Every structure is written in C-alpha cells, then in structure tokens.
Design a binder for these strands. Structure first.
Lengths: 82, 162, 421, 73, 83, 95, 80
RNA sequence: GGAUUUUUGGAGCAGGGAGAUGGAAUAGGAGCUUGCUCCGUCCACUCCACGCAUCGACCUGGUAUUGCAGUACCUCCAGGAACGGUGC
C-alpha cells in the first residue's frame, strides 16, 4: 500500500519540527516525504511572555509550498478536496 | 430555501483576494443563519451577499474568522451574543441593510478585537451625531466606513451624551 | 391541549410500545456476548425513556383535579364539542396520507436486518464503552493497574500473577500500610471496577446497588461489622482493635477517631468508603476475576504464534488445424480474449459485444463490426450518421412580400411569418 | 551523489553563512559532492566587528546554510 | 527516480520563489537553478534575516539540507505534475 | 543472504552491540539514555544495526523541575524504540 | 534482522507513539512502511505541554518518532 | 539504502538582582484548624542595567505624489512604543 496517496488532494495540516503548522491542499509527495501544498497557510504559536497575556497564533499566507521532508513531523487532514 | 450544511459543503471554498480562507454564499436568499459549525474552523472570511437574513444571529463558535461580509441583506435587528462565538474578528461588513436606531448598533461594542466596520447604505447613517456615537460606543474600531478615525472625532465623541 | 386525555393516552401508549419491544427482545434468541450486551445496553436506554415518560405522566394530574368537575359534566356543555368540530373544518385541501402516529413509534423502537440496533439507539456503540482486552464483559484489564502498582511499590519484585493474588485479598492483612500512598491507587482501581460492574450488567438498577452498598456501609461497616472472639472489634479508619463494644462506642466520639489524627472519619472518609466499595464490587465480579486470572495464565504459557493467533480472535494436431492457442483479443466485447481468429471475428459480432456497445452508447453497424478501439467507433458513428441528407422542405415558402426579385426565406422562417401574419 | 553546481562560484569572493550564526568570507577555491568548500583568503567575521583572516580553510558541507556571491558570478 | 515535488521545484526555476532556511531567514528571489537535492541558487534575493532585517543580496546559493520550505509561485498550481 | 546472516551474528557477537546480544542472551536489563534525558531500564527482545529496540519491563525514569526537580518515573510494559534516540547502552546496571 | 519489518506487521493495533518533539500520539495503527512512517487513525494527539487534541487520522514521518508504547496483549515472539 | 541538502534527529533545559510591595475565592507543608511565622511555583508596578542595539509590521498629526498594473515591502518628518526575530 502507498498510504499517503490516499491522503492526496485533501486539505491537510502538516506539523513541522519547530512547531509550525502548514494547512494546505496536499498535492504531491515523494520518498523523502517532501510535500507540495497548494494554498498553504503557516501557523506559528506565539509565546505569551507575561502572566496575563494570552497565547496567540500568527497565520501567514504562503501559496504553493514545497515543504522539505526533513522538516515534517506528522500530517493530518482538515478538509475534503475544494 | 433555508440554510443547512448542504449549502456549505457544495459552495466555493478558496483563497480570497486579500489572501484569507473564503467560503462564498452569494445569491442564496437565506433568511436565517444556522448550522455553520460544519466549516470546521478552517476559514477567515465568509461572504453573505444577496440573502434575506432578517437578523444577524445564530452564529456558532468559530475562532479563526477575521471577516464577516453581510453585504446587501435585510438586517433590521442585530444579534448581541456575537463576541462569544467570533473572538478574533477584524472586519464586519454590514453594508446595505435596514439599521435605523442608534441603540441597534449597541451590541457591536462587545467585540474587543474589531478593527474595521462598514455600515454604509443604512438608515442609521442618516441620523445626526451618528459616527461620533459609533466611536464613543465601539472605541476599538480603527476604520469606520472606510474613513480612518481622528482624534477630533474621539474628543467630540467623548464630549457628547455625558 | 388535552393533557387529561390525549397526552396521558399517548404517554401510556408509548410505555406499552416500550414494554412490547423489550419483551420482543427477551423472547428472541441471543447467539454471542457482544450482541447480548448490545441488546441489554439498548434495553437500558429504553428503560431510561420509560422512566422519563412515566415521570411526566405522574406530574400531569394537578390541573386535572382543577377541571375534573367540568370534564365530568357530560350533560351541561355540548357547545365546546361543536366549537372544536367547527375548527376541525380548517384547511380542508390537506391532500396527504397520515399513517404515522402508531407506525413511527413501533418502527422507531425496532431494528433493521443489517444492524440489530433500533432507531433510538442507532449510533450506540459498545467499543466506546469497552476496550478490546475486556471483550464485552468477558475479562477486566488489570495490566494498566499492574503498571501503576509497580510505580507505587518502587520495585519490580512483583509479577502480573503476583498482582492478581493481591486483588484476591478481601479483609486480611493489607498490601502496604493503609495510611500510605496506596490510597490513591486503590481509589483509581475501584473507579475502574465500579464502572465495570455496572457496565457489564446494564439491566440492573445502578441506584439500587449504590444505595444498598451505602446503607450496608453506614449501618454495619462503620458500626463494628468486623468482630473477633484486640480481636473484639476492628475500626477501618483508626486501624486498631478494642476490648468491648462500650469502649468502641465511646471511642467513636473521641478526637483521634473524629478529626484528631490523620486517619480519622473527617479526613480518611472517602478512602474508607472506597475500600468497602472495591470489596463489595470484587465479590459481585468474582466469576469475572477468575476468568481474567485463567486468561492471564493461558496467555503467559503460550508460544509466539499461539499468542499472536489469540490476539487475532492430447490432440495437438487437431488443435493446430482448428486454430486453437492463437493470440486474439476483442476490446469491444468487454476486453475479452479469443483463442483463434475466427473466434475473434465471431466475438466482435456477438451478444456480449453488442450489449457492451449499447451500454457504452455507440450503436453497432455492418461496417463497424470489426472495430476494436472506441476512438474509431465514435468517428464511424458520426460518419454513418444518416449519410448526409435531411432536407425535404428547407426553402419552399412562396414569399409574396417581394413581388419583384427578392423571395429569400427558409422553411422555419416562412412558418414563423405565416404564424405571425 | 551529484556534485553541486558551484562552477559559477569558483574563484569568486563568497560570503558563507555557517551554522551557529558564524560568518566567513573568502574566495571559493573548491568543492566536493558533499558541498565541503575550500576557501582561500578566508576572513572570519564574528559578532564583534573585528575580523580574523584565517587564510585557507575547509568547510564541511552540512554546516553551510547559504553562500552569497560578493562578486558578480 | 526523482519525486514529484522536486520536479515541481525544478519547474519553479526561472520564477520568483521564496525559501526559508533552517535558521528562519527568508530568501525571496528568482530561482536561477534548483537541484535534485533541493540546492537552490537564487538571484535578486531579498533576505529577512530572522529579526526583520530585509537586505538585498544578489546570487545566493542555499544548501538544500537547510531549507525549511519553499514557497513556489502560485502560477505553477496548474502544472501537469500536480494534475 | 545466508553469509550475511552468519556475518551479522558473528559481528553482533564480537562487535559493539554485543551487550545487546548479551541482553538477549541471559535476559538482563540494560540502562539506555535517550536524547530527551529519559533513562530506560528494561530487557531487550530484539535489536538491529540501528540499535532499534523492542523492550520489555521498561522503567523510564526522568527528572522534572516543578525548587528541586523530582525523579518522576513510569513503567512502560512493552515498547518499541527507535535507534537514533539511543545515547548510551550500559549492559549491567547497578540498581 | 530489521525491526521495521516487525513494526510493519502491526495494523489496527492501538499504540502510543512518543515523537521527537515531545509529542504523545495515542492511536491505532493503520499503516507503517519500510521507512517507519506511521499512519494512525482515531488519534488522541498531545503536543508538548498542551491539551490533547483529537484527529481522525495522522501520518507521522519515520525519523520524527522516538519510541512506541505497544499494547501489553502482543505476542512478540510470534511477531519476530 | 543510520557519516554534511530531506527518514533513525544537535537535542534538552532555565528566563538578571533587590524592596517592612500585593493576591492562591475552592488547592501547600511544618509549628498537629481558625490568626500568626518560615520556606523550593506567577502576574502588576517601582528601582539598578525602561535587559541592551538592529530592521520589519503598526498609531497619531503635518506633508508630497493624480500616476493604467500584475507585486517580499514602499514618500518624508516627529512622538510612542502593544508585536516579531537576530547577537550578547
């Protein structure tokens, strides 16, 4: 079986090693688990640095993303193919 | 026609011109908003052009939303418990509705993170001391009806109705 | 709204349907443990519905005694009947069949062949209520508790079988000092065991069983239920004997028992109640405890494979002259293969080939009999498309509007001109 | 095992960016398929402004993040 | 062989891509050449330097083992490899 | 093939992974340091070239700051462990 | 012998994978490949010092996992 | 097919010092409640060393540009610094 091919073309959330989140349409992959994500958005967790400040999530729009496979931790699905 | 999850699942889901996640709901004649939580919090802006929504209510908890586009609807009354369900909003686009009284804008002060408002083509724009009442009511808004707020407007907003 | 008559009648009928359905279940045969527990859990939800409906039925008679005289007045009245009957003449053109007032309750609390779960309980799932090791009431997993127990003793001198011998203890010497950290573990082990008892017997009254254990605890266990012939009376909390019942009674009101040590009835209460509940529930599950111990001993003694399996539970010249063993294939006849050229020619014009051509949408013909590819068949059907004619009256119009030298119009144009004027 | 296409950057003044924030500049003199570089006139520049000329160095490839061409290449 | 993503990356060369290295510096520039091991050379680089310092470098060469990701141009969204 | 299977058994008998071989010989626990500073006391069922391990009766100890940091431990019964996270395997642990 | 082959003969087994970035992913394995990438379903995933989120499926890369927690009801001698 | 650019990881851990400063509604121990005293966990303000310097995004006022394009970002001056990361 080629399990990641079942997850193809879905809106998928991909967790990077430094803690980032990549939500993108998972178009393609290969042996090293590089990803091609269309319409991908990255999400950085922001440390609060205070006792009363909340923890926020900053989202950057990226577009067509090639994610190198050594950065990837784990991928989950968010949505059907749009 | 009433709105369900069915019209959510089939509609256009994409990246808008301002590069956020967008769901389009143009031209559906929706009278009541319900069952939106099937969007699974993957969206930042939802359009609602050409629907017959009488009141902006029924909004479930969606945290990632930053824009509501309620262009050309029939909003005569407004919902009050909106800030508990849309915590990170930035734009509210309430153009071409039937808001008439000043107190009808009163629930809008509850959104803390709100930055941009558009209440154009509304009878509530027609009355005197309107914009200063919006500033004195909702202070966190930085752009009102595509006019940036000025400190003279803040001062004459604080002066009135003391 | 006829609360007195209609609502109570409907609630009484709904109760009768629930009794009939769980009677139909207790009439039917059961074949395996999963489906037994599933039906017993389903019948529990039906009992919860029955109790709630019976609740509402009992809290609907206070205003009934307010209107009973007026209701009992069947002679002086009649006008209200007429007034309601006149309002029943509203919306006559209601063209609809209505066979659903009793059929929907009957088919609601019944089930459909593929899934032996009724429409009320149709999302009910035993695997959200049991883990796989527990096998739906067959076994209890104590492996997790054994791991928490290793951490608690701070040493590995203790097997799973050794652990089970600890849980065979009842009223004898404790495993650890009862005032130590063993208490947090005992609380957790019990919470699992108590949930498990009710989970595997869902037809038994949980409130009855809880109230009985509470009553036995207060009236007997706290009141000297352990006597010897230091032997005389033992008190769970203060971990000591006592001479006579007179000095036991006068010790129950002393500061060391009430609140003046760290093992008292104010502080150690919940743990002492818990130690009684784990005892009474393990006695009720004594068969299941034996079954887990047997299963552990059977799992321990196995080979690799046995453990893995349990965790899964000659006419050559005639055929040459006839044309056999020849490579041929007809893609039009469902991509079938032929053992000869004549067989390939007869298979291209056959019942299966024509059926596949009709299902594909391309009608066959005399020139398209030998077609194999579907790309050439579309061009063949387009060129065969009634040759090139279809033009009997595409000019006859006899335009009299010209009357000089300009009579130009088509058939449809002259038809529209005759229909317009 | 394909060699990097640094034939443009050969004998040109580079500005390497090594890991740990380290920064060296110099004339790239050679490379292997591992992108280990050989730097001539290598000047190490630290967080302090003063720059140590260290002459001729071999940089292991897995520490290189980036290299800027200080000449036109 | 060569995977579909590195084929997309090779298709992206000649266009303005955006690399992010492992040190978080963002190198947006025209991808002159890319390699099978994701070595990227870019011209007209605008570097962000991880504290906001946007400078402009010319002719960088980024080691592919340090590349966190590569924002490719969105006009490659209809490439036949992505299909 | 078969010569590689004889080669790997003699190499695992005489080479650096001998202690892992010894841990599957007389079934004694090894103390394994991990990259996230977790010590693992447990027997090894099987290993390979990468020091990937299948382990029984594992006690994972580690030190957690809440002050003074405490030796919070857990008992993982059976486990698999990737080999690149292994730091140090010491064959005989003292206690 | 390789132990990735031991891991590939696990399907519909509920494990708890500890990842390299302090993550604890408790879910049942739908697929492991030769490069130790594990595809799980019914995932309860807890990041480091965060609340347990739940996902329908996860697909962890192989180098990013640190260790497993396998079920206690696993005959490993038949699995090797 | 564990030795520099992807998959057997170079990752883990901690946020400077002081002050008869302030709080743990329901959650610390000890002097065996309550009141008090002591000690290994935060936030707000003040002081030394607004932790420091940098650039980007951003708010007020003044000010310039009236221009037909497919974009990291776009006038300048001054004040404030809620945010991001870099090196010490």
């Amino acid at each position: 079986s080629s399990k990641m091919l079942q997850h193809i073309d879905y809106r998928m959330r991909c967790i990077l090693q430094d803690g980032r989140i990549f939500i993108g349409t998972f178009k393609a992959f290969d042996k090293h688990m590089n990803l091609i994500l269309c319409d991908c958005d990255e999400f950085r967790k922001i440390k609060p640095k205070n006792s009363k400040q909340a923890e926020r999530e900053e989202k950057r729009v990226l577009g067509l993303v090639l994610l190198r496979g050594e950065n990837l931790v784990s991928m989950t699905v968010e949505g059907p193919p749009p | 026609v009433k709105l369900t999850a069915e019209l959510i699942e089939q509609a256009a889901q994409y990246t808008n011109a301002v590069r956020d996640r967008e769901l389009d709901l143009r031209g559906y004649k929706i009278p009541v908003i319900e069952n939106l939580g099937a969007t699974l919090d993957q969206f930042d802006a939802i359009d609602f052009s050409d629907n017959e929504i009488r009141k902006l209510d029924g909004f479930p908890l969606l945290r990632r939303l930053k824009t509501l586009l309620v262009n050309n609807n029939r909003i005569c009354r407004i919902g009050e418990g909106l800030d508990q369900a849309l915590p990170c909003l930035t734009e509210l686009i309430l153009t071409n509705n039937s808001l008439v009284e000043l107190g009808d804008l009163d629930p809008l002060a509850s959104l803390k993170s709100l930055t941009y408002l558009s209440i154009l083509r509304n009878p509530v724009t027609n009355k005197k001391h309107y914009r200063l009442y919006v500033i004195y009511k909702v202070p966190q808004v930085r752009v009102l009806d595509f006019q940036k707020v000025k400190l003279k407007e803040r001062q004459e907003a604080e002066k009135m109705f003391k | 709204m006829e609360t007195i008559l209609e609502q109570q009648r409907r609630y009484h009928e709904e109760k009768e349907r629930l009794m009939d359905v769980m009677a139909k279940e207790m009439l039917t045969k059961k074949s395996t443990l999963r489906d037994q527990i599933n039906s017993d859990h389903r019948t529990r939800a039906m009992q919860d519905r029955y109790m709630e409906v019976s609740g509402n039925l009992r809290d609907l008679y206070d205003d009934k005694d307010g209107l009973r005289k007026e209701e009992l007045n069947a002679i002086s009245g009649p006008n209200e009947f007429a007034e309601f009957y006149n309002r029943l003449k509203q919306i006559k053109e209601f063209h609809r069949k209505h066979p659903n007032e009793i059929c929907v309750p009957m088919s609601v609390e019944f089930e459909e062949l593929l899934k032996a779960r009724e429409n009320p309980s149709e999302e009910a799932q035993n695997l959200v209520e049991f883990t796989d090791e527990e096998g739906y009431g067959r076994y209890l997993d104590l492996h997790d508790c054994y791991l928490k127990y290793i951490n608690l003793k701070a040493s590995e001198k203790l097997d799973y079988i050794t652990y089970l011998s600890i849980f065979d203890q009842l009223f004898d010497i404790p495993k650890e000092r009862k005032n130590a950290e063993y208490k947090r573990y005992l609380e957790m082990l019990l919470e699992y065991l108590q949930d498990y008892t009710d989970r595997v017997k869902p037809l038994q009254d949980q409130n009855e069983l809880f109230g009985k254990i509470q009553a036995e605890f207060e009236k007997k266990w706290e009141n000297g239920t352990f006597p010897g012939w230091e032997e005389r009376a033992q008190r769970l909390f203060s971990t000591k004997g006592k001479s006579l019942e007179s000095l036991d009674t006068s010790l129950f009101a002393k500061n060391p028992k009430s609140k003046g040590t760290k093992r008292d009835t104010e502080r150690n209460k919940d743990i002492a109640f818990l130690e009684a509940q784990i005892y009474e529930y393990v006695e009720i599950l004594g068969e299941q405890r034996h079954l887990t111990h047997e299963n552990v001993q059977r799992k321990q003694a196995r080979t690799g494979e046995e453990r893995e399996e349990e965790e899964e539970e000659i006419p050559y010249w005639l055929y040459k002259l006839h044309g056999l063993n020849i490579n041929y294939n007809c893609e039009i006849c469902g991509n079938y293969t032929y053992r000869g050229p004549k067989a390939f020619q007869r298979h291209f014009a056959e019942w299966r080939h024509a059926h596949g051509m009709r299902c594909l949408g391309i009608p066959n013909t005399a020139h398209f009999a030998n077609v194999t590819q579907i790309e050439d068949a579309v061009s063949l059907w387009a060129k065969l498309k009634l040759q090139k004619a279809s033009e009997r009256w595409q000019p006859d119009t006899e335009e009299e509007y010209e009357d000089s030298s300009g009579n130009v119009v088509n058939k449809k144009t002259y038809e529209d001109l005759k229909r317009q004027g | 095992a394909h060699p990097p296409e640094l034939k443009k950057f050969m004998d040109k003044k580079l500005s390497l960016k090594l890991n740990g924030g380290r920064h060296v500049q110099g004339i790239l003199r050679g490379f292997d398929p591992f992108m280990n570089l050989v730097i001539d006139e290598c000047v190490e520049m630290a967080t302090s402004g003063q720059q140590n000329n260290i002459g001729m160095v071999v940089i292991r490839g897995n520490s290189i993040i980036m290299l800027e061409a200080l000449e036109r290449v | 062989s060569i995977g579909v993503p590195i084929k997309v990356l090779h298709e992206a060369e000649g266009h303005i891509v955006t690399c992010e290295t492992n040190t978080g510096e963002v190198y947006r520039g025209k991808l002159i050449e890319a390699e099978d091991n994701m070595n990227c050379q870019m011209s007209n680089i605008t570097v962000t330097y991880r504290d906001g310092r946007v400078a402009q470098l010319e002719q960088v060469y980024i080691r592919g083992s340090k590349i966190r990701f590569l924002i490719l141009p969105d006009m490659l969204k209809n490439a036949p490899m992505l299909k | 093939p078969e010569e590689l299977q004889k080669r790997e058994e003699e190499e695992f008998n005489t080479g650096p992974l001998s202690v892992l071989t010894q841990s599957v010989k007389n079934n004694t626990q090894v103390l394994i340091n991990c990259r996230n500073n977790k010590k693992l006391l447990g027997r090894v069922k099987a290993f390979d070239r990468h020091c990937n391990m299948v382990l029984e009766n594992v006690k994972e100890m580690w030190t957690e700051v809440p002050s003074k940091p405490v030796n919070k431990d857990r008992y993982i019964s059976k486990m698999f462990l990737r080999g690149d996270s292994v730091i140090v395997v010491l064959r005989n642990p003292l206690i | 012998m390789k132990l990735v082959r031991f891991l590939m003969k696990l399907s519909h087994e509920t494990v708890t994978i500890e990842l390299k970035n302090g993550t604890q992913v408790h879910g049942t394995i739908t697929g492991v490949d030769v490069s130790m990438n594990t595809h799980l379903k019914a995932v309860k995933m807890t990041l480091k010092n965060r609340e347990p989120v739940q996902l329908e499926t996860l697909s962890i890369r192989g180098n990013n996992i640190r260790y497993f927690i396998l079920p206690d009801s696993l005959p490993l001698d038949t699995l090797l």
